[PDB]
Design a protein around this ligand. Structure first.
Ligand code: ZN
Lengths: 67, 67
């Protein structure tokens, strides 16, 4: 499935941090849109797991839905 | 014990995210210095707990020392 998240990133270092935690999770194909504060993740991992992984960063995260 | 870490923060959002993962751990008093990319932490938590907590940001972290 393909999920979209809102993630409050401000600089390219913020985007790098999201990339690093998602790399560490594994089993994801992701695309980070820094100026629109959006992260799109294609994964077999549950929405819960993706959301928990993103919130681990200490950034503000919410769910923009499927597809 | 007062621990000192290097954390590669490059914007104020990077710094706030550090403060939220530390708030989540709890039992910490801290100072985050953005231009010098340093986080000082007074805590009874072990060095390894603090290090692991900071690494959840997805940022590059290293240990500077202890007082
Ligand atoms: Zn940043």
């Amino acid at each position: 499935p393909k999920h979209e998240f809102s993630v409050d990133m401000t600089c390219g270092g913020c985007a790098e941090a999201v990339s690093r935690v998602l790399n560490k999770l594994g089993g994801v194909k992701y695309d980070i849109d820094l100026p629109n504060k959006k992260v799109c993740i294609e994964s077999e991992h549950s929405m819960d797991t993706l959301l928990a992984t993103l919130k681990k960063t200490g950034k503000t995260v919410s769910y923009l839905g499927l597809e």
